[PDB]
Design a protein around this nucleic acid. Sequence first.
DNA 1: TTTTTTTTATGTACTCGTAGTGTCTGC
DNA 2: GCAGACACTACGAGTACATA
Lengths: 325, 319, 261, 261, 258, 386
Amino acid sequence: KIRNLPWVEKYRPQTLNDLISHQDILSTIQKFINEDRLPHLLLYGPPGTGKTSTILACAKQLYKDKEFGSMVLELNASDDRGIDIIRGPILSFASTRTIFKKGFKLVILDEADAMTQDAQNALRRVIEKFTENTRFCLICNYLSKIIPALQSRCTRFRFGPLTPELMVPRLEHVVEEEKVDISEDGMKALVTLSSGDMRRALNILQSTNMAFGKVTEETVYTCTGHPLKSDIANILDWMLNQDFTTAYRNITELKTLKGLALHDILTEIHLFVHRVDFPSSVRIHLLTKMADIEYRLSVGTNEKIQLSSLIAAFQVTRDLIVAEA
Amino acid sequence: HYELPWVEKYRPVKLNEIVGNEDTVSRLEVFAREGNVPNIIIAGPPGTGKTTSILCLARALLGPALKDAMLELNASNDRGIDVVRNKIKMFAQQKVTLPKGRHKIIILDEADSMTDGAQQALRRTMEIYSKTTRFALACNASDKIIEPIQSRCAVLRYTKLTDAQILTRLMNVIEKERVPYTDDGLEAIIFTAQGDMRQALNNLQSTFSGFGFINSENVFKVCDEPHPLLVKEMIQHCVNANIDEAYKILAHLWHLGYSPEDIIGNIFRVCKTFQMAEYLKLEFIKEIGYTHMKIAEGVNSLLQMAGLLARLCQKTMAP
Amino acid sequence: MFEARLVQGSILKKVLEALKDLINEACWDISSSGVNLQSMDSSHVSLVQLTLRSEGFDTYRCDRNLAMGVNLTSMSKILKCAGNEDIITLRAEDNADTLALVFEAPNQEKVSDYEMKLMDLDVEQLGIPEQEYSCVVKMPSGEFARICRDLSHIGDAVVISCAKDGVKFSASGELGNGNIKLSQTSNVDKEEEAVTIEMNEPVQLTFALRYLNFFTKATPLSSTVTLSMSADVPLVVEYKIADMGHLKYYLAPKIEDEEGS
Amino acid sequence: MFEARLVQGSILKKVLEALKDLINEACWDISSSGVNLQSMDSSHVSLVQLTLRSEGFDTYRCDRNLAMGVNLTSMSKILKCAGNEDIITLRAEDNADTLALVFEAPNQEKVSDYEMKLMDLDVEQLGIPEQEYSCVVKMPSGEFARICRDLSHIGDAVVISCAKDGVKFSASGELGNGNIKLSQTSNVDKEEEAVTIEMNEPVQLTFALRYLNFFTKATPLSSTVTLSMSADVPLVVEYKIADMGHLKYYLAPKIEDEEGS
Amino acid sequence: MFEARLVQGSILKKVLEALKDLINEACWDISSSGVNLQSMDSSHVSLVQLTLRSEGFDTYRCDRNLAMGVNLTSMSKILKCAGNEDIITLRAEDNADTLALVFEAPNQEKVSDYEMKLMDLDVEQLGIPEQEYSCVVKMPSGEFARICRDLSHIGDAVVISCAKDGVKFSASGELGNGNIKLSQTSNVDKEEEAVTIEMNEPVQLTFALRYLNFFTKATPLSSTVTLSMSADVPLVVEYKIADMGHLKYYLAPKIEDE
Amino acid sequence: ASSHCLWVDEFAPRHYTELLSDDFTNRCLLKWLKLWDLVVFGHERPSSHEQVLEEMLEAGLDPSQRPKQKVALLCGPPGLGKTTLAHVIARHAGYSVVEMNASDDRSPEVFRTRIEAATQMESVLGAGGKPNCLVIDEIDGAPVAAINVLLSILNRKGLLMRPIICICNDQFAPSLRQLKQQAFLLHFPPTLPSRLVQRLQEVSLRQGMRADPGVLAALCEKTDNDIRACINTLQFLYSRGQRELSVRDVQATRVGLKDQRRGLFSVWQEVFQLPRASLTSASQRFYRVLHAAASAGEHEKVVQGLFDNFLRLRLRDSSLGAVCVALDWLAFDDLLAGAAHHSQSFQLLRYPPFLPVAFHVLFASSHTPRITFPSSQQEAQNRMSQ
DNA sequence: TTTTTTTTATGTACTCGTAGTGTCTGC
DNA sequence: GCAGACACTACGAGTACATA
Ligand SMILES: Nc1ncnc2c1ncn2[C@@H]1O[C@H](COP(=O)(O)OP(=O)(O)OP(O)(O)=S)[C@@H](O)[C@H]1O
Ligand SMILES: Nc1ncnc2c1ncn2[C@@H]1O[C@H](COP(=O)(O)OP(=O)(O)OP(O)(O)=S)[C@@H](O)[C@H]1O
Ligand SMILES: Nc1ncnc2c1ncn2[C@@H]1O[C@H](COP(=O)(O)OP(=O)(O)OP(O)(O)=S)[C@@H](O)[C@H]1O
Ligand SMILES: [Mg+2]
Ligand SMILES: [Mg+2]
Ligand SMILES: [Mg+2]
């Protein structure tokens, strides 16, 4: 049947085989499940890498549909997770048995970085004392927000960013099941603008399929609003080659015609500075200047003045680079 | 029955199986043999074995009178102003027959979560009933425990585990578990553990369950290299105003998926104990805090971290 | 269309004051046979099954089956303002979200239409095993509620043991041990007060006290409560309402560890 | 010079906790006919009229017409130390700026006097029009206490209508509406439960929930409560305090918001 | 092995609510003559002496001399589940940390075995309080509890002065003054209501109110109360019980006399 | 029962002659308790900070034959014997000790009835009964209303007829401000190392083991003049395996080291003054200043003291660069406090602990600065509110 | 050899006082 | 049968602090 869902939730890896990237971690987790020795897990990494979907596939594989409510106590940041919950429902779930079928339970704590330090300190002996009856999985994005005792109690698996080589076939499966016409440069633009995140890749694909009907590099860079690599190279060429008024006129004409934003321009220029063989002092000055401009754009500021400062940060170092020789 | 993980299955049951801090563990073994132990606070890093030492000492001292002459309280319990007044005090006055040299043991694990008023109320019940009962506290940060409680005990302090001390128990677990291995893989396990025996056992069990053999690349496929060991070298590169290698390490840590908050926190911890000038360290810490303000308000990209690295390189060349 | 009608409103009051501090939301399962309610508590430890027969209602019609998720904290504030000798009406349309709770005041004049808003919590159907129990005990609900209150004074978790002679209640608490053993007290004038043993295998299990006293709030529902117990399957506190149906409870045992010594 | 004696001490233990949270001052006006209290809030939403006649006092001596103001903060702490069935005597001199309050036992050698500073307040009488309303109905006091607490669990603003069938209490919120229409209960043993309608023009208006719930803790002062309201005249709630006088309340209508998309 | 089978659970019920807030502990001294409780407040204010002999129980067995340091609040949750007309088996082992109480309280076969963890206190010794009392009278118990509640309404301390006509009770407060004069009430049909005067050297002392009212909490337990007081010697109320034993109390007066 | 007791309880003082406190404090407490005999025992005859205490002892009596100081407040660091001296002095003067602690409920009604029970009636034993001496340990942990109840029962003009001894660990608590204007203020100096080393020698000799006095002096300097910590540390280090204590065992940090809550004035003195002359390395001074300033607590008061005291020194920076960067550091702390209290990101509070070590690096001098308490910011805020 | 006070804007945790309220006792 | 007394839990209120 057809369903009205976003593509980041319609296409969810219900099994561990449908996830793409972290093959060694998932093989170790499947060997933990198959040998009935699953320990307390600590799944951490950047967003969109598949940490919630991994433990949901684990809970679906471990327990059937007729007994899922008796085995999984899933608590996230949307629910109240105070020390009353740790000393109350979580402790009573951990210290008791199962109603229907004999087996070990699972307490999934999504967004464990948002838990308070009192609840995390109260969670230590609940994990340690009842490790035979239940297992605790903590999923976080920031490992610095988890106390070192909880990091010691749970073995950690770093769910790193999804590389674009293994990220292609999942997008191909979504395209084939969604009947989407896509070119090679469109898939390249998806796996480039996503930057290790399969959620925003599917969001970009759905938004481009709704906006244009086709997925090409032009359509993706128009729907997202990102500047293309050639235009960033042209902006760098104008800032490094011509005088202030002509480069200002060229960059302002390009930004008016394409409707570009200065944040993406600053990001791509910062990426192109480290590739360009600059001197160390020039690179240090440029990095400090673009850090100042990108900080300045976080408030109610005029974007034209910041664009003039972005040109100025290269017009300062043009003479230094040339006289360096 | 379900098989326990190697952290809790291979918990030491006697005081001679605990490695690390040999003098303190030997004195605890002597106390467990003879008796009349004083009030004890054990402080140290996580995974050192403070709970293991306290429970082994209590099990060896009490024995068959364990279920009635030992009161164990944790952070999962309340331990408020009412629990100290009606539960610690009533158990302290409670009459339990015991052999000579043996006392009731009140184990207060994770005493940092104990409030200040409860620790103030804990003092007089600790001093009055010391003829009949004894106290055993375990903590990570000893500064959270108040000074009158620390004056009432022999505050023992545990150090981080030496690699040979982890290696001996790694031999023990390997020969009872029949784990094939190489030497370099076990050095990789020790390197990933970093003084944490829980992390050593967890990483050894993960590598044995996922691959069945312990070499270096089998360990590093599922475990990770520790983060501040690269941050130390990148801060060292920032000291000599070398922005290229510092950005190389920063981009390597960025492509590994580390959030800017974790990176800047480990930068601050490395710069806390780094070996440079004092004024240079102070302006480095001020620059780190100024960047962390921008991280906290909402803007957190690779450009901000590169700007922080460039400002740290600027601080050296600006006397 | 769904139109149920409680013959007295005191039956609904005693049901939902027992699940007020226990269950999270009321998931009414509606069919032609009757009104069902099978939802766990917040801690996923206890399970409540409630089945009300259609023959006990005044008039009951149900054209199509519905799943009826209703928040109970907002629901339990309406049975406070409900009479006990009074008429309770429950209405639900085919594709709407309003839930008309129409009744009368204790002054007994006025219609009082109160509305609820339905929730969309999908829930997987929890399979009741319906297996034979190795200890079946009939016991009055007033006596079962009294010794659960006395055992909450002494300890935190109670050891409940059943055998050939009778049930036995033990509470290893802070102040000491509290042991109550009752048997064969059917030699009285009343028929509600009776202790009867049906099966043979002797079990021993430890349960949390905070849920056993929660289950005994259904004392005005039934004069006699059936206690079902075995080694693997949990404890059952079974209330059978006289002309409405039955109220079925489950409570998982606690994890205990023997000393190594 | 003002000196008065009460028959019961529970009258001030039932009238003065009601205005614990309405008004910031207690202005008593002395006349030969009796005492008068007309005060407003800081929000200018509720007006309270308290008139106790001189014929019911044990003694009453009055010579001049003055105006004294009493604060609430020190007064509320005093009455918790006072008795319930005792006699309460008051004293106030012509030139002294300190009202004396005595709550002695009816058979006691010594008195207990907790005096307070007289607040010199400059207020004026707005003047109630005492015009003919649109509906005047009589209601029980204790039942009015329950129905004001009834709608407090639904929303923050309630709607009171009064047509020829009865007086309609409505409370619309995010949970669900609740409609209550008291009518035609003259066939009872007590004369208290007789709900009658005297007039006829129907008026629909919206009144704030909190000030009615601040009123209904003074319900055992009287037997019945008379409710009077009109289209633009504020709602009048009438109390008759035994044989010593009467009490009148006033609520302006709550301001209804707009409706948008 | 120690066993004490009290024939009614009402008499051991009515002991403890009299001494609930009064003493923080109970020290049952176990001997062949009977039970003994020489308990003492930590502020040296009131003393409780309780002795019930062996013949007043259903049975009594004692091997050697024993002492029961017992938490009093921890006992009080047992008697809340006890009955009024039932048999109470107060038992303990010789060298053990427990004290069991076996009864059938709800009269529905319900064998309740409630154990109590003993506590150890220091062995303080109060041998014999001296009894050279100048003023002794006998009073009804139910009248004594009512006048102690009457003076608790107004004042916070009672000035008690003995006299040949009777014992005079006085109290003062900001609300008023409570005072009554005791007269000779021996001309009644009830023998417990009669006041007997066998005193000399009248004295006038001041006593606290929060300690006097809980002395009169056990007034249904015994019909007659014997008041004993003198100069520089604490007041004694005495509850002579019918068959199993006797109860007496002690109360130090206030420093500020009259 | 040698194996049934702690060494602090076995070697506890029972007589007056075996106390280890300062002798003055003992004389002052004994003379304060011995003048109470006129009202309690009914007998006329009993048988700088120095000058104020000696004047106030012989200050006379008010017209109630009772002292003008109705309680005695005993202040000092933990581990000297304040409770021990109070109990020994109370048992020496014929009194009976009534102990108040933090393990009681300490609600105002409970406090009121317990003081009224302890102090306002005599003994039940009658003649020969010892009078009741109320000892209130840990009065600094009591709430404000409990101290108000104590001052209400102190000033009844129902007069107080029995002495009360109050023991606290910090006199500068806000709940004990009024008490200090009414009490016999006894300040406890830290114990002398010679008597402490001799008492540790007696303790070690009574247990039949040898420790030379160099390692005992090292233990005394490590445990901060603490009898209880040193005796517990000796009990752990001796055991029965060996008899001779090694210097390297005490010099090791694995046993007997406790975190010490440093005072504000000690922190300001260690920041503004260099240690007198190994320990000459600047990194060790950096870590020591940072750790002790973090361990002191009350960071805002430290910031206010550094703001109010850094301009009164003999500054060698005539170009005002150090003053400018110190004000930059103070503005950095203020910006961090605003950013932590605005964005709800409290992980920015790890850097304002580095403000006192920045002031120590900038203004390290070998002089003796006169550090006063900060009050300009508080009086400015009060005046602005006014 | 030196000691007062409420501002920062939420979120959470702790502790304590108070107030309806179910239930038990008694004439 | 109804008035008084007992403990019970829910709720309002004040205060502290949040980092390594
Ligand atoms: N490894 C993956 N393989 C396939 N699809 C993936 C993968 N990771 C993410 N997705 C897709 O992205 C969606 C969201 O993934 P999530 O598991 O919710 O990400 P996440 O790891 O939970 O990140 P955070 O920290 O919770 S925002 C999934 O429903 C999939 O459609
Ligand atoms: N010194 C040790 N020798 C042997 N095994 C150890 C040692 N320390 C830790 N372990 C192992 O690690 C497990 C956990 O040790 P714990 O004693 O719980 O650590 P910890 O010192 O209590 O740290 P925290 O503060 O509780 S997180 C034990 O069950 C052992 O299996
Ligand atoms: N002269 C002494 N010789 C040996 N031990 C002593 C001596 N004087 C005191 N002690 C012990 O040292 C401790 C004295 O401290 P206490 O008086 O109990 O408490 P305190 O010194 O007031 O400090 P705090 O604030 O209460 S922790 C007790 O354990 C005494 O037994
Ligand atoms: Mg997720
Ligand atoms: Mg531990
Ligand atoms: Mg002390």
